[PDB]
From a paper:
Here we present a cryogenic electron microscopy (cryo-EM) structure of [name] bound to a new cotransin variant 1, hereafter referred to as KZR-8445. We solubilized sheep ER microsomes that were pretreated with 10 µM KZR-8445, isolated the ER-bound 80S polysomes, converted them to 80S monosomes by RNAse treatment and subjected them to gravity-flow size exclusion chromatography. We collected a dataset consisting of 30,266 micrographs and carried out single-particle structure determination. This resulted in a consensus reconstruction with an overall resolution of 3.2 Å and local resolution in the [name] region of 2.6–7.0 Å, with poorest density in the N-terminal half of the channel. Real-space refinement and manual modeling revealed that the KZR-8445 macrocycle is inserted into a fully opened lateral gate. In addition to contacting the lateral gate where signal peptides ultimately insert into the lipid bilayer, KZR-8445 directly contacts the [name] plug helix and thereby prevents the [name] channel from opening toward the ER lumen. Hydrogen bonds between the carboxamide of N300 and the R-4 backbone carbonyl and amide groups of KZR-8445 were present during 91% of the accumulated 4 µs simulation time, with other residues primarily contributing van der Waals interactions. Consistent with a critical role for N300, ectopic expression of N300A [name]α in HEK293 cells conferred resistance to KZR-8445 in the secreted GLuc assay. Competition with intramolecular interactions between N300, T86 and Q127, which stabilize the lateral gate in its closed configuration, may allow KZR-8445 to open the lateral gate in the absence of a signal peptide. Strikingly, [name] TM2 and the prolactin signal peptide overlap substantially with the KZR-8445 binding site. This analysis indicates that KZR-8445 and the prolactin signal peptide directly compete for binding to a functionally critical site within the [name] lateral gate. Nevertheless, the bulky bromobenzyl-Trp R-5 side chain in our cryo-EM model of KZR-8445 projects into the [name] cytosolic vestibule and would likely block many signal peptides from accessing this site.
Biogenesis of most membrane and secreted proteins requires the [name] translocon, an evolutionarily conserved transmembrane channel complex that facilitates translocation and membrane integration of nascent polypeptides. A defining feature of [name] clients is the presence of an N-terminal signal peptide or TM helix, which is required for cotranslational ER targeting and insertion. A structure of mammalian [name] in complex with an inserted signal peptide6 revealed that the hydrophobic region intercalates between [name] TM helices (the ‘lateral gate’) and thereby gains access to the lipid bilayer. Hence, a primary mechanism by which signal peptides promote the opening of the [name] channel is through dynamic hydrophobic interactions with residues of the lateral gate helices TM2 and TM7.
Residue numbers in the entry:
A (entry chain B): 7 to 63
B (entry chain A): 11 to 45, 61 to 96, 104 to 133, 146 to 219, 228 to 310, 336 to 465
C (entry chain E): 1 to 6
C-alpha cells in the first residue's frame, strides 16, 4: 500500500530540517562566482559569434 | 603491440600553476567554438560547421573497449593508442551516417575536427579536468543564453512588424511603444526574468548540504566535517532523462515517414507562454513523469556509480577518517540515514526545478540551465584545489 | 557512437 510513500515524505521533511541551508552572507559570495564564470565565458561566446558575423558576409 | 601508431599528451610531473593551466585548458577553445535536432543540446552537430563531433567519441573511445572486454600508467600505456584508434574509427562511422542523414571532403573535415578534439581531451583532463565533454554542454548553452543581444539586431527580416534595429532598447521609436505585447515572439523581459530567477533558485538549492562530523583515527583532537550534498549526483538524473527524451523524439522523427504536428500527444513537454489548460491528463501529469524519472535515475545511479552508504564508509575507512561516537561498522547506518533518501529527494527537487523552469520558459527549455549551474559549480570545486 | 549512447 501507500504508507511507505508517506514514510518517504516524512523522511524528506526530516532531511530538509537537518540540512544546512545557505545564509545570506555566504549566498552573496557563492552566487558571485557563478555570475563571474557565466559572464566571463558568455563573453567568449559572444565574441566568437561576432567573429562569425563577417565571415558569412 | 599495436598502440605504437599514435601519439599521446605529455605527462605532468611538475607543479602546474593556474595561469598556464587556463593557458592550456581555456585556450584553443575556439576550435569547436568556431562561428535529429534533439541531440544538439549534447552533440552540437547542427549543420556541421566544423562542430559536429563532440562527446560522442570522447567517452566512447575508452568505454566501448571496456564494455567489449566482456565480449596505473602501465594500463595507460597499454590502452592509450588503441582507445584513440577505435574512437576515430567510430568517429568516421558517425560522420558517414550523418552524411546519410562524393562527400569525402566533409567526412574528412569532420574526422579532422574529431582528431583535434580527442587529442585535446587528455590535454584538458590533465589537472583541472575539463575533458569528457564536461565543458561542451556549457559551451553550447552559454551562447544560447547570452547572444540574445546579437540575435535581436542581426535579424534583418522584420515580418509584419519592424525589429531590424533591435528589441533590447527600441522604445524611442514610438515613445508610445508598449512592452506588454504577446510573450511568444521575442519575450525579452519574460525570458530574462525567468533565466535570472532559475539561476537564483538553483544557486539557493545548490548550497544545501548535511555536515557529518568526522575525526581522524590517530590524531585525537583533529575535528573535521564531511559534506553530503542534497543532489549528491549533480547532472546525472537530468542527463539520463535528456537521453530518454532524445531516444524518444529522434526515434519518432525516424518513424514518422516510415511532436508538434502529425504525431501523437501522449507524451510531450507542455510549452506555452503563461499557461494552457485543456486536458489535465498531460499538462500536469508531465510533472509526475519528470519527477519520478529523475528520482529513479538518481536512485539507480547511486548503486551504479559506487557512492552508496557502505561504499562511502569503506572509502572513509581507507582514509582513516571516522565519526566520534559510532563504532567503525555503525557509521554505515548513520550515512544510510541520509544518503539514499538524500539522493531520491535530490532527484525529485531537480525535476521540480526543471518543470518550474519549463513553466517560466527560460532559455534552453529549462534543461541545460541546470547543467549550466552545476558545471559552473564543478569549475568552482576544481578551483578549490588551488586554495587547498 | 547513433543515438544516446551508440
Amino acid at each position: 500500500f501507500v504508507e511507505p510513500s508517506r514514510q518517504f515524505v516524512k523522511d524528506s521533511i526530516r532531511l530538509v530540517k537537518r540540512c544546512t541551508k545557505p545564509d545570506r552572507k555566504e549566498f552573496q559570495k557563492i552566487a558571485m562566482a557563478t555570475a563571474i564564470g557565466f559572464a566571463i565565458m558568455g563573453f567568449i561566446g559572444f565574441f566568437v559569434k561576432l567573429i562569425h558575423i563577417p565571415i558569412n558576409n | 603491440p599495436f598502440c605504437v601508431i599514435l601519439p599521446e599528451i605529455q605527462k605532468p610531473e611538475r607543479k602546474i600553476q593556474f595561469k598556464e593551466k587556463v593557458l592550456w585548458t581555456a585556450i584553443t577553445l575556439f576550435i569547436f567554438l568556431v562561428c535529429p535536432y534533439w541531440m544538439r543540446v549534447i552533440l552540437a552537430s547542427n549543420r556541421g560547421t566544423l562542430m559536429a563531433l563532440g562527446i560522442s567519441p570522447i567517452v566512447t573511445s575508452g568505454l566501448i573497449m571496456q564494455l567489449l572486454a566482456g565480449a596505473t600508467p602501465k594500463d595507460r600505456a597499454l590502452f592509450n593508442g588503441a582507445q584513440k584508434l577505435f574512437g576515430m574509427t567510430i568517429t568516421i562511422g558517425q560522420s558517414i551516417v550523418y552524411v546519410m542523414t562524393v562527400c569525402l571532403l566533409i567526412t574528412i573535415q569532420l574526422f579532422v575536427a574529431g582528431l583535434i578534439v580527442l587529442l585535446l581531451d587528455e590535454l584538458l583532463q590533465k589537472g583541472y579536468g575539463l575533458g569528457s565533454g564536461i565543458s561542451l554542454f556549457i559551451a553550447t548553452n552559454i551562447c544560447e543564453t547570452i547572444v540574445w543581444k546579437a540575435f535581436s539586431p542581426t535579424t534583418v527580416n522584420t515580418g509584419r512588424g519592424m525589429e531590424f534595429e533591435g528589441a533590447i532598447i527600441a522604445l524611442f521609436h514610438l515613445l508610445a511603444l508598449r512592452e506588454a505585447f504577446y510573450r511568444q515572439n521575442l519575450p525579452n523581459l519574460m525570458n530574462l526574468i525567468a533565466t535570472i530567477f532559475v539561476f537564483a533558485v538553483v544557486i539557493y538549492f545548490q548550497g544545501f548540504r548535511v555536515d557529518l562530523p568526522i575525526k581522524s583515527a590517530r590524531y585525537r583532537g583533529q575535528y573535521n566535517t564531511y559534506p553530503i550534498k542534497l543532489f549528491y549526483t549533480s547532472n546525472i538524473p537530468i542527463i539520463l532523462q535528456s537521453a530518454l527524451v532524445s531516444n524518444l523524439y529522434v526515434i519518432s522523427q525516424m518513424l514518422s515517414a516510415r511532436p508538434v504536428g502529425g504525431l501523437c500527444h501522449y507524451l510531450s513537454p507542455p510549452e506555452s507562454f503563461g499557461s494552457v489548460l485543456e486536458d489535465p491528463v498531460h499538462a500536469v501529469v508531465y510533472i509526475v513523469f519528470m519527477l519520478g524519472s529523475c528520482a529513479f535515475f538518481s536512485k539507480t545511479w547511486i548503486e551504479v556509480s559506487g557512492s552508496s552508504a557502505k561504499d562511502v564508509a569503506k572509502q572513509l575507512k581507507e582514509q582513516q577518517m571516522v565519526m566520534r561516537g559510532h563504532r567503525e561498522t555503525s557509521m554505515v547506518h548513520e550515512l544510510n540515514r541520509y544518503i539514499p533518501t538524500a539522493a531520491a529527494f535530490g532527484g525529485l527537487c531537480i525535476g521540480a526545478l526543471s518543470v518550474l523552469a519549463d513553466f517560466l520558459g527560460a532559455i534552453g527549455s529549462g534543461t541545460g540551465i541546470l547543467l549550466a549551474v552545476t558545471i559552473i559549480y564543478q569549475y568552482f570545486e576544481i578551483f578549490v584545489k588551488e586554495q587547498s | 557512437x547513433x543515438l544516446x549512447x551508440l
